[PDB]
Amino acid sequence: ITAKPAKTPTSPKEQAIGLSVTFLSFLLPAGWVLYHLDNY
Amino acid sequence: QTHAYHMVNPSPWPLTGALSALLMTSGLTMWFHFNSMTLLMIGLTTNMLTMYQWWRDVIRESTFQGHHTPAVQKGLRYGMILFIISEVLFFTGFFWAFYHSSLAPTPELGGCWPPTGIHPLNPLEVPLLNTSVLLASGVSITWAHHSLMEGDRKHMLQALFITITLGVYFTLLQASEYYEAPFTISDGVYGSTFFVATGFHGLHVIIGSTFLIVCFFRQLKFHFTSNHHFGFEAAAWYWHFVDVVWLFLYVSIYWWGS
Amino acid sequence: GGGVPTDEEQATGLEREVMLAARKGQDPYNILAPKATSGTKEDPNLVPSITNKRIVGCICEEDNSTVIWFWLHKGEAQRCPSCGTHYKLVP
Amino acid sequence: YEEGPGKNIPFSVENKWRLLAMMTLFFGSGFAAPFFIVRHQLLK
Amino acid sequence: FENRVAEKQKLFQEDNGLPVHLKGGATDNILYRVTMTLCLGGTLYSLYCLGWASFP
Amino acid sequence: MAYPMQLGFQDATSPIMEELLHFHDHTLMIVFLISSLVLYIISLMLTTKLTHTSTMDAQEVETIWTILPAIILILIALPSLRILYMMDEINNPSLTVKTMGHQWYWSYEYTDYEDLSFDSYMIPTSELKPGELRLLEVDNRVVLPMEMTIRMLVSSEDVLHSWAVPSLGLKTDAIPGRLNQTTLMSSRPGLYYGQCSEICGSNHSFMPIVLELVPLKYFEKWSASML
Amino acid sequence: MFINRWLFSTNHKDIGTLYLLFGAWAGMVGTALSLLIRAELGQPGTLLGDDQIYNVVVTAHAFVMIFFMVMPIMIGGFGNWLVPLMIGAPDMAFPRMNNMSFWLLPPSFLLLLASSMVEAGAGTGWTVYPPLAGNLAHAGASVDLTIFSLHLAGVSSILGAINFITTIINMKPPAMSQYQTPLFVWSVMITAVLLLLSLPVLAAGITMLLTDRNLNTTFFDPAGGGDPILYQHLFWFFGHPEVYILILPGFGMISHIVTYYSGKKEPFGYMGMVWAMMSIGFLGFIVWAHHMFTVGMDVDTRAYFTSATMIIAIPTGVKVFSWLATLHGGNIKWSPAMMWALGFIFLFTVGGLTGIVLANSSLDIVLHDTYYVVAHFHYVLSMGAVFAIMGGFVHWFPLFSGYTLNDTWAKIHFAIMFVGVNMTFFPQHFLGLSGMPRRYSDYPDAYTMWNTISSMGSFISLTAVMLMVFIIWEAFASKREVLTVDLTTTNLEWLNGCPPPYHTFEEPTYVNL
Amino acid sequence: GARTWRFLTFGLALPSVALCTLNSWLHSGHRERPAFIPYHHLRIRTKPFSWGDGNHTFFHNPRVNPLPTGYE
Amino acid sequence: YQTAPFDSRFPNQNQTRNCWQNYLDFHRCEKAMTAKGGDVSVCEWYRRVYKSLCPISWVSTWDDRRAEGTFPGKI
Ligand code: HEA
Ligand code: HEA
Ligand SMILES: CCCCC/C=C\C/C=C/C/C=C\C/C=C\CCCC(=O)O[C@H](COC(=O)CCCCCCCCCCCCCCCCC)COP(=O)(O)OCCN
Ligand SMILES: CCCCCC/C=C\CCCCCCCCCC(=O)O[C@H](COC(=O)CCCCCCCCCCCCCCC)COP(=O)(O)OC[C@@H](O)CO
Ligand SMILES: CCCCCC/C=C\CCCCCCCCCC(=O)O[C@H](COC(=O)CCCCCCCCCCCCCCC)COP(=O)(O)OC[C@@H](O)CO
Ligand SMILES: CCCCCCCCCCO[C@@H]1O[C@H](CO)[C@@H](O[C@H]2O[C@H](CO)[C@@H](O)[C@H](O)[C@H]2O)[C@H](O)[C@H]1O
Ligand SMILES: CCCCCCCCCCO[C@@H]1O[C@H](CO)[C@@H](O[C@H]2O[C@H](CO)[C@@H](O)[C@H](O)[C@H]2O)[C@H](O)[C@H]1O
Ligand SMILES: CCCCCCCCCCO[C@@H]1O[C@H](CO)[C@@H](O[C@H]2O[C@H](CO)[C@@H](O)[C@H](O)[C@H]2O)[C@H](O)[C@H]1O
Ligand SMILES: CCCCCCCCCCO[C@@H]1O[C@H](CO)[C@@H](O[C@H]2O[C@H](CO)[C@@H](O)[C@H](O)[C@H]2O)[C@H](O)[C@H]1O
Ligand code: CUA
Ligand SMILES: [O-][O-]
Ligand SMILES: [Cu+2]
Ligand SMILES: [Mg+2]
Ligand code: NA
Ligand SMILES: [Xe]
Ligand SMILES: [Xe]
Ligand SMILES: [Xe]
Ligand SMILES: [Xe]
Ligand SMILES: [Xe]
Ligand SMILES: [Zn+2]
């Protein structure tokens, strides 16, 4: 396939932020539940 | 467009139908477990409103707007045939349950069929009358079909009225036989098979009778042409399906199973 | 014993347009498969369109399972890129 | 209706950071749900 | 009965931009509003019933 | 029982389990060979810059690819069905034992001669004696005579269970209202373990089976002492 | 406008988009459930609770992965987007019924999530066998909510099947025979026929379970002369076809991906591929009792079900060999989609071969209700169906969105997922041969090493799932618009551009005879 | 044709219904109900019915449908 | 007598009817022998076979139902 250059380029820093936010959105809520199992 | 197919206007009825399904199922749950019919009665009401408006719109699209080209009609033919096939396989599951239980009666039954303590209906009395009624209705609907193709409004209406009257007669006879039956749905696998299989059949008779009554009012309003009348064809195919299921129930449950 | 309308009397909208065109041997709504010409530059397949381009599928030989798809544009006849069969747009 | 890239979807991609928030809430809520149902069952 | 299909063809082909489910006129809007209100209200009630049934 | 880092079947305790091991060896060779050939051919298709992208004729090659698999399936089915019918063969048992599945324990009935029955429960982890196995020991083992054909009849008094002893090649569903038969013959004395093998609720993981295979004379005295 | 477009749709592409979003969300639910399973099993002892909470998680895992992730993505998503485009049709036959197939799924999912929230959940297995699933051993609403979830999912799929069969039969160009339609279109038509015939039998069976639970019927209750084994026959008469329903659209996407990235105009042996899919569909109806080899059926019945099941290897092998013959001589493009497809060919083959082991009733006595079965079906589902979904997603994302993925990120994603799924499931073969049962919250100590490794694998797969969400974000964040796509002459779905207009084929294709 | 199917409706189908109606008519009237025996495979109650007192079937006929404890 | 022999009428995994038939046969024989005040020792083979094969709870349930008058088999 060919494609145009990005209309809104995502820099390495911007990618680190999106990847970090993505991973935290999975890991923090599950981690909170599993940390608190004994309490439950 | 330079094809013959129907681009349907954006419609709310798929969503109201899907939500009616949620309300009926959550409603049955609320009735079986939380002693309340309220959700179920909302779901049945929204289901009937959805069906009414959706099929009203199909009539608007076809009779009033002309979107049912031969290509569109051919698609509807396939859709109704495929729907009937799915309904056949649904009944196949109940016949399987019936043959499984009756061909290998367990010790709890007395090791015999019919089970100890079951007094079956006489298949030569009301069950035979029901058979004559649905077979007769298969003949009258065929008369109605040919009258419509021949352009005869009065005879189409008379034949279709006779067909509906026989469907109603079958339903009243079945209601009476349910009340008179000395066995119930709780009378082991005999009652279970008898009432669930005949009960789903009775529901299909009511659905098919309703479809025929829709066709009767559409005919009164001149919707059908002598060549274009798919709703009538579909109702007739459905009605033959209901007849054929009855004949299998009669031979299997009422006669061979007695 | 009458009283049932005919399609001639009561068909409307696209159903009626298809009905009236078929009486005249015409196919404006593409119900029929078009019959091929020899497909030479002198005798190209004539492809009707209501715009200035239309997709052609070329079944290059009878019973090929592979259909070759391409846009045909208004102007000089184009060739199927697999078999070289000529097609000319008639807008 | 709007046609073309970023327009044939029920969510906006006009702002990549708003989109990150929306995607976070969407996928995160699905992944979280079973942990919170387990918590619910353990707490009865 | 008289054949009034032509008058319904004219009504449902009127160039007024209405979708087919509203093209009959004001009664269609009322029946739409009743249907959608029962559906959405019933759905909110089904969610309340889940909340209630989720605890002893 | 299984041992740590085990790759294959528990060692055969019965002749039919021996047969199943040899049949599995034959079948696994075929699985290995076909898996390996597909991986090798993928790698062969992907490692050349040479090309041929014009239409390719299929019919000759499809003969090889249907016939060779058909022959391989026949070579699996033949010994598969020999073993199926061997297990089903008439053997003349010396003893009949019944087991009833319950939530969550097994009961055993030895009613050829006297009214012997008892319940068999998992030893709780906190009550294991030193050297005993977590989740596998029971209070009352299924004592049976070694080197003898035994008819085991299996049912349930509640939900589905399944009575399994892997080292004897045994797994029979425990269905209420149904009496399922299997045959058991141990070539050796010892202790042979199994676990409930149909999801049956809260303690499905915790209702094991222990057979204790001993000489007939020991089995007879044990039977008498359990009345 | 937003409500009209997204809640009142009559458009095949927008409805396909709704299905892909729904399936993606379902995949996150099913992944979380899979991690709860592996967290419980990842060290000896008890983490969550006893087998009831554990088997509620296992049961929900299966229903979510099958009915809310795989079927909606393959059939509702890829099928709605691609089938009309691949036959030059302006939409589906029943564009408004199509929208109802979609909107039945959120309510179906809501009933499943309600089942798990009320009482103690439905800890039954996805098979829902009585009497554990009956009103004594599972009293209260959970199992009824599960049955109603299945009813709504089944109506969705039955109406969808009617739509696909009608569209594929009736809405091709008049010159195009069935033997000139692409293999993906065949794969959807055959899957639709399987749905139409199988789901009504499931409907009958779970309806019988509902009446045994609520109306004092005794279909499955020996006290009334019923039989728990009748339920198993009705369930599996649906359940074997269902696994072919799960893989057939995968087979169709694999054919297109292998052809495309081999630089070929056509798959090898088109009519053999059609024959193979129809043969698998047919044979798929006559093998169900290989799920019942331990229930006590007669020896001759076991012999028949062994033999009939093994026959499926012949048409399936023709497909595997035909994919290899499509690669043969290719100008191979090592795209991420091609990597998914190559992983599929190998890993599907392994799982199909462990299925042939299981087809042998004598050996199945020892393997039934063990992790050997779990290893078999996760090779074909978590490495077959899922690899076909991921290959199709990365191949067609630019068509659907008009934007490109970052191919390097997509290759990283593939590599992590490949390691995770193999680490998860390969060791389960050893656990099954050595006798570890299914649906256990805890295991004898001997099984610890392989359970530990399996759970570590599941966490690697989680990392791949998290990265996939980032990779989709990065594509929409960066907005690299598609320009040129190769091989449009043999891939009609691309010929209207990326994304295609809301209305395509308003003027149909010209195809002569 | 329509004429032939009308001939079959009135000449064969409705006469058949009339004769079966006559047959049913002549065999109507109540048969003596059998001695109640509390068989465990009949009058199943695993869960109360969702109507009435929970112990009556939906089309309960007191004359011919005994309860688990016998006739009313 | 050691245990119930192979019976060609019941050759398959499902032995339900074997237990049932032998329980019926014992009780039919016992009724036939007690009616004439004949000898129930002639019924002994059926007794041994049903006792060997039948779960204790099945026999116990069937006996209770014969006492109650709710046994559904013909004796
Ligand atoms: C996508 C899903 C999927 C697919 C396609 C399959 C495909 C197959 N399955 Fe499987 N199966 C499951 C999903 C699937 N299965 C699930 C979910 C269960 C468990 C259900 C439950 O209990 O919850 C299961 C259970 C299951 C059992 C029951 C085991 C038990 O419970 O004890 C059996 C028994 O025969 C079976 C067999 C097979 C066979 C023979 C095929 C065949 O179709 C495979 C054919 C493929 C090949 C053989 C490979 C390619 C061929 C070649 C390279 C040619 C050469 C090969 C030879 C000569 C052998 N599977
Ligand atoms: C499609 C079906 C499917 C899939 C994909 C999986 C995936 C996984 N499954 Fe399972 N599983 C089943 C179906 C499936 N499973 C079934 C039917 C059972 C039997 C239930 C029963 O016994 O009743 C079962 C049982 C089962 C068990 C046995 C439980 C027991 O017997 O006690 C285990 C144990 O480890 C397991 C683990 C996992 C793991 C770790 C994954 C991981 O590989 C999952 C990793 C994540 C993914 C693969 C991503 C998924 C998401 C997408 C692909 C979304 C894509 C998004 C876009 C395209 C935009 N599952
Ligand atoms: C002339 C006959 C017409 C039938 C109309 C009767 C009732 C309404 C429902 C009809 C639908 C049909 C079948 C549903 C199940 C059972 C009813 C069977 C027929 C019937 O009416 O059976 C009665 C019992 O009804 C009962 O329990 C009543 C139970 C009422 C609640 C029904 C629960 C609904 C079940 C869910 C349906 C699921 C559908 C699946 C869709 C598939 C999706 C893929 C029999 O009465 P009785 O007193 O036991 O015996 C007679 C004694 N004198
Ligand atoms: C107590 C009982 C309550 C239960 C609820 C269900 C009850 C009743 C439902 C009864 C079904 C009524 C269907 C009415 C359809 C009217 C629309 C119609 O018939 O539309 C026709 C098209 O057919 C088409 O869509 C064909 C459409 C076919 C739909 C048929 C569906 C059968 C429905 C089954 C529903 C549930 C069954 C499941 C049970 C388990 C319109 O085309 P024509 O006729 O050619 O007209 C055009 C000419 O005028 C031109 O000259
Ligand atoms: C306890 C409760 C659990 C069950 C939940 C119930 C589920 C859902 C609630 C249903 C709401 C139904 C509302 C009516 C739907 C009518 C569909 C219809 O009639 O669809 C037609 C196509 O299907 C055709 O023909 C032929 C097919 C017509 C089928 C009609 C409806 C079937 C509903 C249930 C079917 C399951 C089958 C049972 C067998 C297992 C029309 O297609 P459209 O795309 O609209 O238009 C196309 C235009 O060109 C027309 O001018
Ligand atoms: C299967 C999916 C899950 C995989 C594993 C997830 C990886 C964990 C991610 C982090 O999760 C967090 O971990 C913290 C601990 O590291 C928790 O804080 C807890 O512990 C802290 C340290 O004691 C306290 O300060 C906090 O108050 C307390 O909430 C916090 O709640 C939780 O969100
Ligand atoms: C536009 C929408 C807004 C309107 C809201 C709807 C209002 C519904 C109120 C009616 O409530 C009902 O009350 C009945 C009387 O209490 C209940 O019968 C219940 O109690 C009866 C009394 O004994 C029993 O006989 C029945 O079996 C039993 O289901 C019934 O379940 C319940 O639905
Ligand atoms: C789509 C398919 C639809 C199928 C419809 C329903 C099928 C019912 C057919 C009868 O079923 C049989 O029942 C026998 C008992 O009546 C079984 O005998 C088994 O069970 C008996 C005790 O229950 C034993 O005495 C026998 O030896 C033993 O072989 C036999 O295997 C089985 O085939
Ligand atoms: C369009 C919007 C949608 C409309 C939503 C309307 C919701 C209003 C429902 C009213 O709720 C009622 O509450 C009753 C009690 O307060 C319940 O009675 C039932 O439960 C009672 C419990 O006290 C008992 O008397 C009986 O079981 C029975 O009468 C019954 O569940 C329900 O009808
Ligand atoms: Cu008992 Cu599992
Ligand atoms: O199901 O294999
Ligand atoms: Cu199967
Ligand atoms: Mg099992
Ligand atoms: Na654990
Ligand atoms: Xe194999
Ligand atoms: Xe859950
Ligand atoms: Xe869930
Ligand atoms: Xe589901
Ligand atoms: Xe279903
Ligand atoms: Zn050409």
Numbering used by the authors:
A (entry chain M): 1 to 40
B (entry chain C): 4 to 261
C (entry chain F): 3 to 93
D (entry chain L): 3 to 46
E (entry chain J): 1 to 56
F (entry chain B): 1 to 227
G (entry chain A): 1 to 513
H (entry chain G): 12 to 83
How do the authors describe this structure?
pmcCytochrome c oxidase (CcO), a terminal enzyme of the respiratory chain, catalyzes oxygen (O2) reduction coupled with the proton pump, generating a proton-motive force across the membrane. Mammalian CcO consists of three mitochondrial DNA–coded core subunits (subunits I, II, and III) and at least 10 nuclear DNA–coded peripheral subunits. The electrons from cytochrome c are transferred through CuA in subunit II and heme a in subunit I to the O2 reduction site, which consists of heme a3 and CuB. Cytochrome c oxidase (CcO) catalyzes oxygen (O2) reduction at the heme a3–CuB site in the transmembrane region of the enzyme.
(2) Fully oxidized CcO was treated with Xe under an anaerobic environment. The strongest Xe2 peak was between the two benzene rings of Phe67I and Phe68I, which protruded into the space that branched from the O2 channel in subunit I. Xe3 and Xe4 were bound in the hydrophobic channel leading from site 2 to the molecular surface on the intermembrane space side. Xe7 was in the cavity formed by the terminus of the heme a3 side chain and the transmembrane helices (helix IX of subunit I and helices I and II of subunit II) at about 8 Å from the transmembrane surface. Xe8 was near the molecular surface on the intermembrane space side formed by the transmembrane helices (helix III of subunit I, helices I of subunit III, and a single helix of subunit VIIa).
